[PDB]
Symmetry: D2
Subunit: 388 residues, 4 copies
């Protein structure tokens, strides 16, 4: 029955999340702004651990440093008031007409110039609040048109931009690191660095890649219809899963930003299972919007569904891997053998074996049925009886 | 008028292309199996340059060392006869039942071990036909609904295969180069290395990344709904586009393999641009399937189609970047500036420079309309003319 | 723990289901044919209720009436042997080159002529085995090309065809009825009557529509990414849900034909819930293929996952609607008011009210938050604690 | 050369078209709000025939009976001034927060009751501007993740609205006609009546189906990945295509609203065919949004684009069905026969007729290649020329 987020399951929420007034393509804000002091108070009280924020979430675009300083101060009084942390921080580069056509990769050069600056102004802040990850999400970087942007030129600029930021952090001797969060489309026709692989492949070209990793969003990859779990496992493979955005989505459509556990449930389980197994140590961060039909408490309800959800799955998959029956389904499915190396020690000398080609009996191997519809149904009950 | 191809087009075809028979996932085969000698011979007439292959396309499954040979002499005699060429070869590791859970990533060690052997057999052939590049498309590497594969182990396994692969290719002085051929799903539910990005990233974890590069299909990225051109741009930036597969696909759906031009017409204009404006010297490989409703010149004409379509598109893009009225418009939207460094000398001291930020007029800049809509119309009247 | 199909939960399987040898686009049958006598024996024993069959599943295409009669006889000996029923029957019109390009709507006229005949030959059989539904699935009816078929002409033929079949049944005084099962694509580019609505809208034009209804497949509608439950509720709305095809799928891709409960779990629950509530009385029919990695028992495992699955969901949704807390979430969500009529008795005289326009307080109504993220999470646990 | 539109094109634009400002789901507004008088005036220059509208497009939300009036005189004075026209009007029932769970299908009876009233207010206007047809696009009618709406009650409710609607329209002698405007998702997660089919079907359950018909968008069916032309064919067969919304969409993704020609170029050729070969006399309504990267002639040119593109496409299809070489090919693939009754006199006695079946040569017929690939190439060289 009653799963309890304890500020140590590392649940953190982007200020923009519960803060979403409900304004959409086709309609008016269905709710009022929340004050970041108010937010922090209330996530603390649900068992949260921290907030994450875009510059503008905190500090409204007009920056009278006076005003500005008395924003951060108000903020910071809550963090200790409540004991909440700010793990991660980002820049808003997609809501001001300026950004119409990107930031790092905008056509005009002072827009690329402004945009770094805007961002360098907040890494610092990211530093001071002791965040340990600085995320970067393209948003206005792609092509609302067609051949309106030469993508290697553009891909040069992405690089230039990232290569300058890493230089600053190095220089200033800051203890952050970056996380490129890719997205297929919405709002630009086609966004640049559109999947965990792209982002991942891109990082390899940067001066110091050891500084850069990814920040995948469940629903973002779902939007190109891909296995998220498979994508995240690649990230982990690369030593690159530096942060995660947990939310729900229902297959290829606009960014929905549903509650976590909502949308694709089986993929939630398979996700969580993995995060629990591959030891992700990071912050179980949530980037969802409680829907706009959904009310002052609706926000929190939706906030909390987020946590009940990682917590049940976390469990159902726990009592899954530990099912003796289940562990004898897995071996039946030769998952132990996947785990063995194909050609070990001293040997590219499978060349000289017969048991491998000349003599190998295909139809023997042919005959052995994979035994996965049975493992699947063990995991479909969440073990036996009960679901998950 | 009509745009006849010639050998210097570098237009290739898989034997499995024009030679597909109709065996869909729900029907029978609508065509007689055509033979190599025949295939090579009409291609040569159509205006084709090379021919590509699979082991099993050429050498029937269980054949002998002699039944092998006679195939190969025969193939070989007709290349010269026609002076056609074989710039690329590939291994079938997905049709036979032993390959039901995969080849390099089977949960069963001696199939893993058998797919390496079968591959080496073919490298050696490909090798001796002067194949310049060696392709590799999984197909059976994924999971229909997994608990069935730890994607972290498979990637261990996947890597090991290729590393083994690159040793032999170098062990053996061949002048060959690997090319991972991504695909999202079908036949698997989820295919490991589903796209260009994942693949590109993957190559960088390999132990000799220079022997790798990527072999994309238009339809295959289209199945994830990516932006093919965009995608090839990222591969031509990585300097990793070793070979391409030209195609037509009408949306996130089963692998169609429509003739090139077919599918996203417009996507196609931008590729020949990219490809033609970018210097791709590789072959224009057509991995398309002539619809099953069609007889032999049914077959013979779609394949013709494939080539007129590169050629008309070659044309119309060529002229796009030569309409004086278009060059105006490339300036207009500042494509020029995309092509200028953002902050060029050492140059992080870009930092106090009061115009980047302090004294920058976002209000002024925001007002700049991108002049994208008129560049897009221009490339529609293919410039100020008759269609693109 | 251990949910028991009792031949009265109406679980029935298409002979082609468990019978699937595993042959796909890219590979060889991974299994042998099962003999329909063998199948029937084995579904009986899992708690099934009946089999459904295409003509050709039973009676292999060459029809020596001698042979043929001694096929049906063999069959029919099992049905009473086991007590299994044949509720539904169909025609295979998509695997013979003949059908390359449709049946009812094929370009050539004797192919449309053959095809009715082929089908009239089996309605009779459908009659004799006492089936009560005769399903029709397009499959080869659509456009692998582009403007290769004039769709109103074609839509005339669909009509002609259906209008002739209904005439026969009327005439012969048979007690069947038809169920058009639509599909978006796979194998023809674009299939005609592609969604429950299309099929539904089409039925209205036929001479006697009272004879015709739909036979939706979960994964078919999923393939156009639509809500199945919403689609089925429309069918029920029309008095047209005449049969159902239960299977799983993972979003927009090729027909997967996964186990029921597999793919989109939340939509399974929402489906089942509804079928259980809207009183569907029909046969909980399954059209799935146990995957080709998946073995002689794998087949049955997968068969049985099908049933464990409708049976748990059937339960979790049972103890959902009956949760007092849940019933006080629903009222909180004004679902009782949806159920009330907007403008009743004698009245289009909302015209004369003020409480409806002139005086109506928007912001009052504006303010009331829908209370659906809370109902959702009740249904996300399956009530409380336990999932579903 | 260049293809100038004129009034007899019957090309319309929504005021919300060229007048969109940029407010995306993640950015601010990139444009000043343009006024009606302005809108009507440049359209008139562009070469436009009519203008369509929403209540709130024209008359600002809470305006008075006088603030109303002055708007209307003003709109009205500029129609004549320019002699433009208003063939269609529509009600905004999706932007204001009172419309957060829907209009006709809100789970709250006095919003339901308020959306009927607001609509009647506008029918009366539309009515007195000589609007020929009255559109209706939900947008807020669906569920983001439902347990939230019984789709059976909503359809009860949905039906009731429209029936009420058709009474007044007839009660009041207006010469108006309803047109349900389908859409799959966005802003809702799932939108009731997601497509042409569902809508078409729906109209037949209404109590005066003749006052209904359908208003499709290219992008909206494209969001379900249907086959737009196909879809419009089904509406022109039902004789239910009252009005169309021309557009560009690049795949199963958020509502783009690209200029017509934009998106599926090729889909577009087949529509003007269909539309032009089929006699649609209705307006060619452009519901497109000028990308936010663009200023006023940014705006002004995409909208120009929309119209040259119908016109070039009009051309190229016209000529398609006039290439003597094409008419050969329509014969070749027997388009002729599709257009002949299958079994024409009374004619079920088609039954013994030994050629339909007994004496039919399936083997002979199967061998007929459909000559689809060459008809498709012909409509590519738009015939034997320069592009389509
Ligand atoms: Mg995010
Ligand atoms: Mg999101
Ligand atoms: Mg390929
Ligand atoms: Mg392909
Ligand atoms: Mg079915
Ligand atoms: Mg299916
Ligand atoms: Mg519209
Ligand atoms: Mg639209």
């Amino acid at each position: 029955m009653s799963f309890q987020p304890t500020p140590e399951d590392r649940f953190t929420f982007g200020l923009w999340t519960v803060g979403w007034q409900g304004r959409d393509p086709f309609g008016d804000a269905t709710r009022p702004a929340l004050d970041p002091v108010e937010t922090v108070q209330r996530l603390a009280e649900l068992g949260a651990y921290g907030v994450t924020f875009h510059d503008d979430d905190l500090i409204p675009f007009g920056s009278s440093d006076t005003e500005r300083e008395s924003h951060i101060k108000r903020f910071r009084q809550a963090l200790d008031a409540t004991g909440m942390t700010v793990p991660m921080a980002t820049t808003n580069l997609f809501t001001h007409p300026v950004f119409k056509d990107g930031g790092f990769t905008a056509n005009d050069r002072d827009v690329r110039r402004y945009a770094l600056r805007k961002t360098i102004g907040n890494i610092d802040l990211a530093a001071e609040l002791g965040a340990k990850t600085y995320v970067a999400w393209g948003g206005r970087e792609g092509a609302e048109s067609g051949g309106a942007k030469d993508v290697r030129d553009a891909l040069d600029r992405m690089k230039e931009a990232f290569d300058l930021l890493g230089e600053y952090v190095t220089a200033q001797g800051y203890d952050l690191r970056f996380a490129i969060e890719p997205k297929p489309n919405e709002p630009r026709g086609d966004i640049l660095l559109p999947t965990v692989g792209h982002a991942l492949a891109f990082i390899e070209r940067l001066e110091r890649p050891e500084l850069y990793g990814v920040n995948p969003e469940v629903g973002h990859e779902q939007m190109a219809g891909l296995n998220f779990p498979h994508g995240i496992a690649q990230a982990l493979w690369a030593g690159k899963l530096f942060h995660i955005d947990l939310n729900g989505q229902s297959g290829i459509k606009y960014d929905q930003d549903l509650r976590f556990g909502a949308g694709d449930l089986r993929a939630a389980f398979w996700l969580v299972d993995l995060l629990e197994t591959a030891g992700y140590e990071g912050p179980r961060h949530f980037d969802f919007k409680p829907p706009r039909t959904e009310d002052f408490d609706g926000v929190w309800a939706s906030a909390a569904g987020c946590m009940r959800n990682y917590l049940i799955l976390k469990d159902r998959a726990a009592a899954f891997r530990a099912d003796p029956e289940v562990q004898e389904a897995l071996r039946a499915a030769r998952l132990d053998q996947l785990a063995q190396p194909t050609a070990a020690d001293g040997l590219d000398a499978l060349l000289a074996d017969r048991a491998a080609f000349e003599d190998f009996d295909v139809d023997a191997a042919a005959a052995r049925g994979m035994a996965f519809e049975h493992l699947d149904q063990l995991a479909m009950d969440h073990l036996l009886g009960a679901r998950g």
